[PDB]
Amino acid sequence: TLLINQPQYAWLKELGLREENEGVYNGSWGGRGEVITTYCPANNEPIARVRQASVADYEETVKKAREAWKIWADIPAPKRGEIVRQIGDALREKIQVLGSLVSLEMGKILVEGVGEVQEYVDICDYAVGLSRMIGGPILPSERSGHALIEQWNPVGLVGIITAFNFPVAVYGWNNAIAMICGNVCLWKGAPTTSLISVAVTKIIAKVLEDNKLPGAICSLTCGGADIGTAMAKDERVNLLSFTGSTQVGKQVGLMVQERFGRSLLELGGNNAIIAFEDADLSLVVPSALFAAVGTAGQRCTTARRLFIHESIHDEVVNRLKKAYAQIRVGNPWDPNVLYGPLHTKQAVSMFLGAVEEAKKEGGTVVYGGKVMDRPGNYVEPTIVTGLGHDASIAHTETFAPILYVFKFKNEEEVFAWNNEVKQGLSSSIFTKDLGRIFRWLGPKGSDCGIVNVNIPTSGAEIGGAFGGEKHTGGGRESGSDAWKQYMRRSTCTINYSKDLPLAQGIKFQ
Amino acid sequence: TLLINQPQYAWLKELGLREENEGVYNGSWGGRGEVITTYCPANNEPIARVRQASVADYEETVKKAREAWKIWADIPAPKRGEIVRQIGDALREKIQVLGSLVSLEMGKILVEGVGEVQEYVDICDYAVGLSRMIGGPILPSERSGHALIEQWNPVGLVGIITAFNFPVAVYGWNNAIAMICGNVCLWKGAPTTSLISVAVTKIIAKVLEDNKLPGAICSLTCGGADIGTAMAKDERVNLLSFTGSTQVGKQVGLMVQERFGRSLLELGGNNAIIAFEDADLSLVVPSALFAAVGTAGQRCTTARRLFIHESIHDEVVNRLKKAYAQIRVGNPWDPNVLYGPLHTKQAVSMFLGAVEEAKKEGGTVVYGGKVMDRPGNYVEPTIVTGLGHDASIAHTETFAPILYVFKFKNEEEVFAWNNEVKQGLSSSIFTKDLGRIFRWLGPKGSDCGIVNVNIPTSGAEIGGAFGGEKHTGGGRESGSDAWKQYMRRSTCTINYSKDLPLAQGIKFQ
Amino acid sequence: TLLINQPQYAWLKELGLREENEGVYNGSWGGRGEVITTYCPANNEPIARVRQASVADYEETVKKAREAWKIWADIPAPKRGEIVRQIGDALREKIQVLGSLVSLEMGKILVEGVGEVQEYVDICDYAVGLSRMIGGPILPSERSGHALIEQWNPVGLVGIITAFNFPVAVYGWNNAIAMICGNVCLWKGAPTTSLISVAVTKIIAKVLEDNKLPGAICSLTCGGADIGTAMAKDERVNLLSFTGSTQVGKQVGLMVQERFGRSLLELGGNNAIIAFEDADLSLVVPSALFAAVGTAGQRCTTARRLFIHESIHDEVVNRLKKAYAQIRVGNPWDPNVLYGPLHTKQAVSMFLGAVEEAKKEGGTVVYGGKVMDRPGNYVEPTIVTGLGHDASIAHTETFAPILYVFKFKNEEEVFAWNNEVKQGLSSSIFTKDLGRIFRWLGPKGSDCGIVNVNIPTSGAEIGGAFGGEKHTGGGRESGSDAWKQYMRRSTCTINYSKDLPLAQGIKF
Amino acid sequence: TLLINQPQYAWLKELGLREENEGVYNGSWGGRGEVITTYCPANNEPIARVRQASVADYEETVKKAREAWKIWADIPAPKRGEIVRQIGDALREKIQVLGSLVSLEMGKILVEGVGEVQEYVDICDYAVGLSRMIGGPILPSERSGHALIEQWNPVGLVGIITAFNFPVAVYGWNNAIAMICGNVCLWKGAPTTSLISVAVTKIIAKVLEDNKLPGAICSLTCGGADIGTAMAKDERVNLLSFTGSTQVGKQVGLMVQERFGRSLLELGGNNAIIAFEDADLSLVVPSALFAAVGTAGQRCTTARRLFIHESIHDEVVNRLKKAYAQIRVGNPWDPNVLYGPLHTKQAVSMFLGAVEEAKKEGGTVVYGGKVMDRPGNYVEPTIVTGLGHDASIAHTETFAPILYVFKFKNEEEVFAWNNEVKQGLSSSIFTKDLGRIFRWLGPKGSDCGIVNVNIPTSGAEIGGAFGGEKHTGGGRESGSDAWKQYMRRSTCTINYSKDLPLAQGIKFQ
Ligand SMILES: *C(=O)c1ccc(N(CC)CC)cc1
């Protein structure tokens, strides 16, 4: 029996969810594709069903979205910002129930569920002001009687593919920025968080409908690999923002590049925390814990590698283990719980696989490493010591709560060890040395898109451009001038004079 | 026998050119790959020889360049700008002999040869000031006692692959920007302009060596497709700047995405001039002429499509016909010449082929279309009417002086025809209508990277970012914030406070 | 009796307004100064009274404001933006009663009273995003192992003196930008719009109070010339944003410059519309009309000079006559009314004085020019022809609905005539000539702070920096990088190396 | 007799200086005012004479510069940059003789004389690139069919009044920026450095004339307070850049404000150095020495106040006195000499008076404090301890090598002590504490325009905006966006649509 049919989950109806929901929106609701059932990862019980998009659904949707763009692009950017502001308020009005759904279908703890929705509300308030600012410089032309200007226009249709772990905010940050930039959007979320994608889409839909705007401006085509690949190969998709694993992201990027389209890739992470001898241990230990076990280690910015100086290595590990024992586990919707279940049953298997490989490669499990004997997809937060820093499994992103601890001696080698992996999302060092801090930020420091000091790998905010380097994709979202990725630059020369070109010996007229 | 061994060409020696020249520079001069002889396209005679890089030479060069980066990247950006300043002066001191070499080996007329070198001089002076400006904003953090900064660092090794038509300035614009940004450069130019590449490298090498800097900061590895492919597949090449055809650029782009590297693609063009009924025809006819026949139609920004409104179609054509008949043909280095040869004999084959396919697709040759009985690779400037705007040969970049003329009635359809091709480099309308001019610059206007008004498609300067959209690659060079393509962005959060994270019910210390 | 005591004006109570109101706020409410009574320009009746600030009130308010700054400047800018966001929402909840108060105490039509409040609401939303963006560039130092950064910090206390014609939004645009930039604010509104100042202050106070912040962050000291003069001389006022007449602003600027303080001046205007022969007359006539008679000619951006090409002059004027006679007059809060009363009785007399002085200078009144025989400060919309462009009364800002119409021949001279006056706020041409348009925007073009094409002199918005040149002050508000005027710049070089200076022959 | 008649100073003729020189340059060279004689501060001997500007000279010059502006303003900004580039070149060619003139007439040592000319050279190279960059943003209008652009135009005539201590570079940095911004310049340098002003003018004059440009673009009218006051009152001076004392600057500022003009004020300084307990003393001692005695303590950024923590107070003071004794004083035009003479005889009097006023204030001279028995205006570098930090002479800018030393205990109070004075030009702290450094840069830190860490108060470069706060004037020169002070902003809304305003119940046509 589906949870949404049980009286205790009647609050799901406040998001407009039913026993069977439509997973396509383009002004109209539909879905002739495969009917998927999503499950609560805390108890493996089925919640509700979503009818995904068929190829024909995708086709019709893309066409409706591009026709809607003809209208949306002619709307002044500040007025597009007004729509985004209204989307912000609309999310506020549903922040608790939507945050509850995120906890229910995805499995993160409630304050992170609500918090993720707040991140979307926050990016909306940000995009409202940015909508009056987007543009380029007026340059002084070297030619008398000419103007030189930099114009920015929408790319057209922005395809948005998102991962499971942040089923609201990742789309949200692409949505808010793309909309003020005059783009229409097409969403294909993770299949396992389909209800969430429908819930958000319903909220946005009403805002567009109340303002007499075509709903295809924020289109939805639920589905899996097939819909996603279609988006990657569709020339009508002017920008494809892909958020997910490196393995899938590599193929999406290659498909987009094949058709000379634009891609925005936000891929995997393997982020390290480095603790030098002069570090504040009262700061290092709790920072490492929450960055490693937060969301059960299912953040792209999760701390997965911990380099500690030889002098303080044993102490920091011992203090970590005593703190790992206090981590409260249970239902994600339980306010006393710090630590929820993994998203899927396969995630649990990957967890055990990495643990076994780590041990085989000489590692030692000083805490955890076992599956919790209880309903749901619960595993113990895990700390592994002894592995060589260049161990294969350590160089591999395992989307699970496993922290590999390494020893080091000097600044030069430990910087290289942070950079020696293929991923390049987030990084952090903990130290008080002024010279070291700036070298860390310099050309011989971290090669990551996020480079932090005395704050763990999860430290980011709206004002800055978010993304990573190398195998992380190189794309950027949110702040700074990240909006430029959602627009096309044109360099324009306007001759307003009555001057004629030099004839060069040629008799004209 | 070689031209360089003749008295009238003794000026070649002033560029340090000999009978056979080493085609590899990395601090040392060498080359053990295939020997190539480059020819003057004006008379099809051998000039001199260059010993190209072997694969082993390339490996050695990359190693030395990356080692040279360790030193170059530690040098303050303004001091890197001082180096670029001296490069500019060195080019100034050799501008006539180098300009002549460009005219001799590539085949553009002398004023454009010198002019191209002048462009490298100008971008150097520009980069000097820019070296003191590159960087990111300090942002206000949402967290108390935290600083949020945006850092920019060199990507490292910048591979530059350039085309034949601008064998100096294309590399030059990439070089000046990359160097102030802290990168080392490895250059592979077009094989048929190898002497020009060696000459430029000698000039830069002397500056680097006079400043006691490792010469591998500006490395050279002359070679063909194999050396290029090696660069495209080399992980040690952080950024690959490719300037060339779309066919080759597509494959280069894919190899780079395959290894999650960075590419900058400046590819083919099929640029259109659109003349409206209200256009000043005394401005249109000369603008169209010079944009079409300039550099024997071998500019990437060459005008290849000419849309004329029905009312003025025949008048513009006749005036172009009478104007074309006055174009002065001769050797590039001859005074007061306007039109030289095509670069290769194969390029002449393409010319004839496109002409044949044109009249087979319904086109009429109203001027030119034939080869000139003269030493070298000389063809007649050509005007073709009657072709449908969607004809296959019209949607193709034929790098020869062929101008396709079309009729249009209204503004909506003619904007679409400019945009319907796969290329998206440059575009121009000639009109006096205020509204139309802004619609042209707007979201419903040209889709090109360069959108001009009352100035032909060749209209571009340093101050702005240069590049195109769609199949042109998306890359940008020179002005605005194009320097960000040669650097990696990091978003950095610095905790300078003594605050500790919330305990969340866990007892630490 | 007072208007606030009559049943039909009971809606005033929704704004916290009483018979007699405190005109001082600094976390606490008070007022031991003189009691002022403001009046309704539509019927010359008293609305309610306000206790203005005494000297002691001013002193304790400044001190409390600078104390509150120690807390406010430590609050991260994005969080300050959140406060400004809540102020925006609080304004939305009172947008109709506040807009009605503006129509009542100031005199503009209801849609503009509401419209002015909406402008404050919009600048708040704008400031929210901007609060995450304010800052300077990290620059590449020429010194190895050195960092070069441009920092921006709040100036501290920002004094805000405002005019009567826009008694809500002018303060609003200053308040929103100043707050995200980390400053505290002291507001001295126009005396004749004291109730509006109190009402707006009550709205902001609750938000600050609900968020457990010191109320002095947005302080209010109602008062006249003496309080304003004090702010101009007070070294504890790090920035004085002044919005008012040129005459007053000049003295304000000199006092602030005397003590090496910072000033932001937004002063008078004498804004011109120029209609060339190639202009769309269907655009020119209604644009000229609304720009000239809007808010009874009481905008700083109001069109006062109209230059028309001699070939279209007579046609334009005639069409303006026919349009002017359809202008609907009445109560500003009454529907379909386009035209309310002047702000004060003094303004009416100044209106008549300019009319007579224009006749004596050789001008001709082709429409209006008289006082309307009705309750309130109502005067007819006026069009004056025949004056020479260099006439004294034309060069003078008369804050009243008077439009001076001139003829011109060439583009060169008419550009000079727009620039020849002392004011330099707004300017507009109506033409289709591509070249002329860019010349208008160029070095030989308009010398004004606002330079418009095919849109009248009142064409402005939030995204742009708002201000004028020459006798208009030179200050800027709202958009672009106008926030820099509310902060101080510092250029910082940071040596993080272990390298020592060159000994230069000396042994250490 | 004059020093320009002794063949030992024959090199003065390389700058085109004669016995009596014209001090007025517009299109022509004139001077009907008083004839001033300038003296070498090292031997109190007359060098040469300069015929200064009469009132008629000033009126003619002003009128001629405004006519020249009509031509100069039509010249594209990048082409104006080319002129500035040539100015930089001409200075390079005369850097040795002009630098020697600075040492002769002003009194600073030769490397600082040549170095000051190099500063002008460098800002010229900086300006060239900037001239392609100046402008405002294109913004999205909230109105359909409307463009919103920010424009920047020259202010017109930029009047420049400069001090004695930097008689080349201060004008230089004003000139380079003002010119590329399209303004003409009127220069009135310090009366005591008249020869330098004329020499600099002659260099620029040759450049302008060789380019067939009206020489009035860089006009010169030598004079004292009378010419300066006329500029401050002149409505035809759209911008007055004043560089000098706070006393004079105040009155200048008031006059310009009286007539609603623009002023850029760069005034007095009273710069402090704060050394905390955790400071590297190997860095502090030489840093404080060179900052205090540099240019005989006649820099506007000279360190005049020195706050040392009580724990390290006695040591640092001793080390300074030990190093102070090693300072090699002599002729400025002589090698290995670190300290030269004061500029005038009146400067020596002010020096002694300040020494006396500090003794009566309870301070103790621990080194120097007396005049040097030798020709010229030579004084001993002085160190004063025991003074109260709020002593009247301590808050006073005495333009002589006098360093007041104060003790402190905690961070909050010593920050206040740096800000407690009227001056706010430059400030420096020396420490390693991460949190302290950021607080120093924060809202509760220094109130100065230059806020340095681990570098003396003389630390400034081209890239950043140079200027101070409070009684220092508020003006900014050189880097960042300081160029906006030389131009006027306009916010331009362009209606390019065919739309008509709402009739509001009125019948039109
Ligand atoms: C002139 O009357 C005037 C100037 C500025 C404003 N603002 C901007 C601060 C409020 C909309 C209103 C009126």
Short mmCIF file of N, CA and C in Angstrom, two decimals, chain D residues 9 35 39 65 89 93 109 130 188 226 242 259 282 286 295 305 319 325 335 349 361 394 407 438 445 456 466 468 507:
data_model
loop_
_atom_site.label_atom_id
_atom_site.label_comp_id
_atom_site.label_asym_id
_atom_site.label_seq_id
_atom_site.Cartn_x
_atom_site.Cartn_y
_atom_site.Cartn_z
N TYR D 9 76.99 71.37 -15.60
CA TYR D 9 75.56 71.10 -15.71
C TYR D 9 75.08 71.30 -17.14
N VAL D 35 59.18 86.84 -12.99
CA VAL D 35 60.22 85.89 -13.33
C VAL D 35 60.84 85.28 -12.07
N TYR D 39 66.14 77.19 -6.99
CA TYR D 39 67.46 76.90 -6.43
C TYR D 39 67.64 75.41 -6.17
N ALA D 65 42.82 76.04 -24.76
CA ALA D 65 42.71 74.64 -24.36
C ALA D 65 41.29 74.12 -24.59
N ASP D 89 57.16 56.88 -24.43
CA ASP D 89 58.39 56.64 -25.18
C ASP D 89 59.35 57.81 -25.07
N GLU D 93 63.27 58.15 -23.42
CA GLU D 93 64.44 58.68 -24.11
C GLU D 93 65.16 59.76 -23.30
N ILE D 109 67.14 61.82 -4.03
CA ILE D 109 68.30 61.12 -4.57
C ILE D 109 68.03 60.64 -6.00
N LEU D 130 44.07 50.73 -21.01
CA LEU D 130 42.85 51.24 -20.38
C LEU D 130 42.00 52.05 -21.35
N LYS D 188 49.58 73.65 -13.48
CA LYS D 188 50.33 74.60 -12.69
C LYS D 188 51.07 73.86 -11.58
N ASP D 226 48.33 82.62 -6.83
CA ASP D 226 47.46 83.46 -7.65
C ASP D 226 46.87 82.71 -8.85
N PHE D 242 43.71 68.78 -7.46
CA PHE D 242 44.66 69.45 -6.59
C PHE D 242 45.44 68.46 -5.74
N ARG D 259 31.13 76.88 -6.87
CA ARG D 259 30.69 77.04 -8.25
C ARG D 259 30.19 75.74 -8.87
N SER D 282 62.77 41.46 12.07
CA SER D 282 63.70 41.52 10.95
C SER D 282 63.06 42.22 9.76
N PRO D 286 63.79 47.56 9.27
CA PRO D 286 64.15 48.26 8.03
C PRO D 286 62.94 48.91 7.36
N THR D 295 63.14 59.91 0.92
CA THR D 295 63.03 61.26 0.36
C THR D 295 63.13 62.31 1.47
N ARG D 305 54.21 58.31 12.38
CA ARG D 305 53.83 57.76 13.68
C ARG D 305 54.17 56.28 13.74
N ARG D 319 67.05 49.16 17.94
CA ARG D 319 67.45 48.67 16.62
C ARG D 319 67.35 49.76 15.56
N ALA D 325 71.94 55.35 12.52
CA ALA D 325 73.31 55.86 12.52
C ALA D 325 74.06 55.47 11.25
N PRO D 335 76.11 58.41 -5.65
CA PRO D 335 75.79 57.01 -5.33
C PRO D 335 75.96 56.66 -3.85
N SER D 349 63.32 75.33 9.05
CA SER D 349 62.74 76.08 10.16
C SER D 349 61.55 75.34 10.76
N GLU D 361 56.22 69.42 24.66
CA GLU D 361 55.05 68.57 24.81
C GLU D 361 55.37 67.34 25.66
N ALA D 394 51.94 65.80 17.29
CA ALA D 394 51.83 64.44 16.78
C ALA D 394 50.73 64.33 15.74
N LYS D 407 53.90 53.73 22.57
CA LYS D 407 53.67 52.38 23.06
C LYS D 407 52.18 52.10 23.15
N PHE D 438 42.45 40.70 9.10
CA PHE D 438 41.15 40.92 8.47
C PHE D 438 40.33 41.98 9.20
N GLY D 445 38.45 48.50 11.30
CA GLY D 445 39.89 48.66 11.12
C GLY D 445 40.29 50.08 10.78
N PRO D 456 55.37 48.73 4.62
CA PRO D 456 55.34 50.11 5.12
C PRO D 456 54.24 50.96 4.49
N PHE D 466 44.83 55.21 -5.99
CA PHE D 466 45.59 55.91 -4.96
C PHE D 466 44.85 57.12 -4.42
N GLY D 468 43.27 59.04 -0.29
CA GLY D 468 42.98 58.92 1.13
C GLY D 468 41.61 59.44 1.50
N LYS D 507 -7.92 62.45 -25.85
CA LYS D 507 -8.00 62.26 -27.30
C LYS D 507 -6.90 63.03 -28.02
#
